[PDB]
């Protein structure tokens, strides 16, 4: 916990420590008041979230590719958890 | 149960399922045996038998498609279109089934939403060969000008790939006797049929008439007539047609000018 | 250690098409973030942040 | 008794789908348009006085589901046709809020009032859009006055943030061909209509009729200002647009 979300600020801001630190500060408030999930956990209604959004933009190609990729990610059975995955991808669209 | 999951996905194809069925035209229901607790469940496949039943009369389209070379040209340019929607209709049951081998169950509420959008876009192809029972041209385009009035605007989106693959032997009909002078029939589908009487040389004679009765809706009829006195003179994409054979009519009547200067 | 490298990639293209401007290095941290079950929601927010 | 609670709950479920149930059956009274339920004799009379709550949310998805049945059978080309086109939009979300539901009596659980709180965002959603279709069943209306009954409705539903979004959307795809045939007048003064879908009907200078079988906007002088633009091309806020739309194409 503590050093994964260090490492977000270093990547992201392409600096080390001592440069990021205010942030940092931010960061650790906002993730910690907040830290388990506040939506009941369930991967259907996530996957419909990003469908519709390429939908909506008239990209209906992609939203059957994507349709494929969904099952390439679930088939592997390495990551579980996948929802908070996707919904994190679909926010920052 | 998870049987039954799978056995909904083979009746999309329109493919029999593993269950005896009396039903096929009616809809696709199935008759396991013990169907009377399994309604409720039986039921919920049976909303999604309905959407095979429509499958159906695409499949049975695409079988006349081609014969040893079926009547129109437009007849069967009609219906590449409506076998291109039917193969992306396919594309969610390759990744349904692809879905029910992972390390399996997906439940039936879940994929009632995955057939609801193909639910709005093949019940609209399954209204559109209601209309049309004969394959001759220009009734095809009549089918498509009077879908495309209509309400609704998720199947309008659907209507107008179709316009642009229905219309495109329409206007590759029109493009060549505008400039050159040059037409072709293949069984009388475009709306000029040629030789009233006989051929004769040309200075503006009857040979061609407008042919109402498979003319395409998407010229107005004053505006079929506008493109017949073209083609002897050399001799919503619906809206763009009307356009240009304006700017035709001016380029042709140089060309009629000359003729005076032969005389 | 090889289908960990295969779901990688699938994940990469799921950030490909959505536009998201993450890196194969940022993918790989909110990933971890992620199945440690912390909130996408919270997670989300100190991202825009941070690119700030 | 927690466990009568648990069948009857995936009952429930089965019911808002549109799906009959295992002791919940469905009996025609109006032909479906509201379903006359009956729940049968369950022995826990608690559980079966509670199930009584949740069933009229699944009434006011039967008067969606005509909605969209009832404007196709006249095969219309008009903004009625598009505003069915929208509950079918707010019919194809709700099936996901169902689904989750069933999803969760899969594994882990949902007890009644587990049910009743979530259901309850959408039961006041579907009762507002019960409404509006059944002041429409009366087997009208045909352009203009679809967009007039809507506009009077947004107008009083005014101070309730809840309804004034939901309204939004409807109010909206119900002008997008409306606006069309607003330009085709404003521009060139000629007429679009497949069949009446246009306030200002037809039968140089011409021989223009209104009528209120297609109701302006939400006031009548700005129809006469339409009126009066389309001669010269032949020789809160959305009315508002006509009067200096009018006063440079004069």
Redesign the interface.
């Known amino acids: 916990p503590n050093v994964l979300l260090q490492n977000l600020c270093c990547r992201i801001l392409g600096k080390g420590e001592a440069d990021v630190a205010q942030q940092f500060q931010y960061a650790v408030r906002v993730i910690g008041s907040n830290f388990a999930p506040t939506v009941e956990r369930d991967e259907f209604l996530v996957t419909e979230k990003i469908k519709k959004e390429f939908v909506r933009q008239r990209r209906e190609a992609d939203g059957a590719l994507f349709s494929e990729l969904h099952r390439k990610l679930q088939s592997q059975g390495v990551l579980k958890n996948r929802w908070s995955i996707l919904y994190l991808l679909l926010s920052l669209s | 149960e998870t049987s039954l999951v799978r056995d909904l996905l083979y009746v999309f194809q329109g493919i029999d399922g593993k269950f005896v069925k009396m039903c096929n035209s009616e809809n696709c229901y199935k008759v396991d045996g013990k169907v009377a607790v399994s309604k409720s469940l039986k039921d919920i496949t049976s909303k999604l038998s309905e959407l095979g039943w429509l499958h159906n009369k695409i499949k049975k389209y695409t079988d006349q498609r081609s014969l040893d070379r079926a009547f129109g040209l437009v007849g069967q340019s009609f219906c590449a279109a409506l076998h291109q929607e039917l193969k992306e209709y396919y594309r969610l049951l390759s990744v349904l089934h692809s879905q029910l081998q992972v390390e399996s169950s997906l439940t039936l509420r879940r994929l009632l939403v995955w057939t609801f959008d193909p639910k709005i876009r093949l019940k609209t192809l399954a209204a559109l060969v209601d209309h049309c029972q004969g394959r001759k041209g220009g009734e095809l385009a009549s089918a498509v000008h009077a879908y495309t009035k209509t309400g609704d605007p998720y199947m309008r989106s659907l209507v107008q790939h179709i316009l642009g693959l229905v219309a495109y032997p329409i206007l590759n009909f029109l493009y060549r006797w505008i400039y050159d002078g040059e037409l072709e029939d293949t069984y009388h589908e475009f709306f000029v049929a040629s030789d009233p009487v006989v051929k004769t040389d040309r200075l503006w004679h009857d040979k061609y008439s407008l042919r109402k009765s498979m003319i395409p809706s998407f010229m107005t009829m004053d505006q079929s007539r506008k493109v017949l006195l073209i083609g002897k003179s050399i001799n919503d994409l619906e809206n763009a047609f009307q356009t240009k054979i304006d700017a035709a009519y001016f380029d042709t009547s140089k060309y009629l000018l000359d003729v005076l200067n032969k005389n | 250690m090889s289908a960990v490298r295969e779901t990688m990639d699938v994940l990469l293209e799921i950030s490909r098409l959505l536009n998201t401007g993450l890196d194969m290095e940022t993918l790989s941290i909110c990933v971890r973030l992620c199945e440690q079950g912390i909130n996408p929601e919270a997670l989300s927010s100190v991202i825009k942040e941070l690119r700030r | 008794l927690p466990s009568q609670e648990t069948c009857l709950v995936e009952?429930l479920?089965?019911i808002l789908?549109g799906?009959?149930?295992?002791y919940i059956s469905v009996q025609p009274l109006v032909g479906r348009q509201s379903r006359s339920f009956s729940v049968e004799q369950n022995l826990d009379s608690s559980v079966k006085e509670l199930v009584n709550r949740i069933l009229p949310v699944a009434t006011n998805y039967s008067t969606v589901t005509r909605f969209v049945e009832e404007?196709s059978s006249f095969?219309?080309?008009?903004?009625?046709?598009?505003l069915?086109?929208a509950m079918?939009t707010l019919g194809?979300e709700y099936?996901?809020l169902?689904?989750?539901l069933?999803?969760?009596q899969?594994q882990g659980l949902l007890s009644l009032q587990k049910l009743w709180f979530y259901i309850q965002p959408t039961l006041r959603t579907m009762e507002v859009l019960a409404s509006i279709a059944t002041s429409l069943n009366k087997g009208e209306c045909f352009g203009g006055a679809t967009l007039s009954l809507l506009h009077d409705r947004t107008f009083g539903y005014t101070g309730d943030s809840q309804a004034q979004e939901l309204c939004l959307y409807l109010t909206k795809?119900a002008s997008?061909?409306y606006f069309d045939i607003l330009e085709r007048w404003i521009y060139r003064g000629i007429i679009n209509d497949?069949y009446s879908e246009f306030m200002v009907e037809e039968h140089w200078d011409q021989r223009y009729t209104i009528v209120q079988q297609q109701i302006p906007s939400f006031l009548q002088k700005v129809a006469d200002k339409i009126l009066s633009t389309g001669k010269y091309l032949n020789v809160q806020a959305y009315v508002e647009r006509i009067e200096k739309a009018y006063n440079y194409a004069s």
């Open positions: 009952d479920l089965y789908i799906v009959d149930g295992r404007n095969e219309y080309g008009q903004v009625n046709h598009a069915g086109a079918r194809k099936m996901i169902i689904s989750q069933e999803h969760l899969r795809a997008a061909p497949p």
